[PDB]
Amino acid sequence: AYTNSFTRGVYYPDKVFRSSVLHSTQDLFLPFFSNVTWFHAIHDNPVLPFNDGVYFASTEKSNIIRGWIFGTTLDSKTQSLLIVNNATNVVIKVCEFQFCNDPFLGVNCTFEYVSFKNLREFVFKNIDGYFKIYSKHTPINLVRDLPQGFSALEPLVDLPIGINITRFQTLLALHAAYYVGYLQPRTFLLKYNENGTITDAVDCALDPLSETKCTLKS
């Protein structure tokens, strides 16, 4: 199943505070109204390529989806990032786990750290071996698809795993529809309010009107 991304998947490109300005950033965003794959967790964790950058949107009501995996083969033949969030703990590991044929969760290691109604949007990307995560949480009242609106995402962790990630996967807690977007190097016209909160954005490569808005910086 496919659907439109509306105006979601926006995050702060850097950790610099900007107020009452319109900043243009050449960064991996998802395109507005883009075709985002739809996955069903009722009554699916297939092979998902990472390409040059990957977005994630999860609409949750019972926290079925909790973790994510990253790597190339995911059969303990190479280092594989593993992130698991169970109960109130966030556990991250990077080493060669021997995953099952159909990995799932029931209801040589180099790095390790331990800490619908809800939208947990996510961003994942590797830059010269640096894994960056962007996240934000917002409440909605909708189950069919992505609600139409605007909300920015803020970074949480930098994980310099330096691991070849041409594929990824999700973790489903089996006794939760989740979305897979994709980020392309597109320039965005980010509008910061007086508080430094991104209240609007323009996808400079969406349509000629957006091109005009970006060229005029307005």
Partner: peptide, 20 residues
Amino acid sequence: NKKFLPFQQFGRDIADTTDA
């Protein structure tokens, strides 16, 4: 009185110089 988000360390102006 400028609110800096917890990940924000510096604030910069139009001319690339640090503002806050």
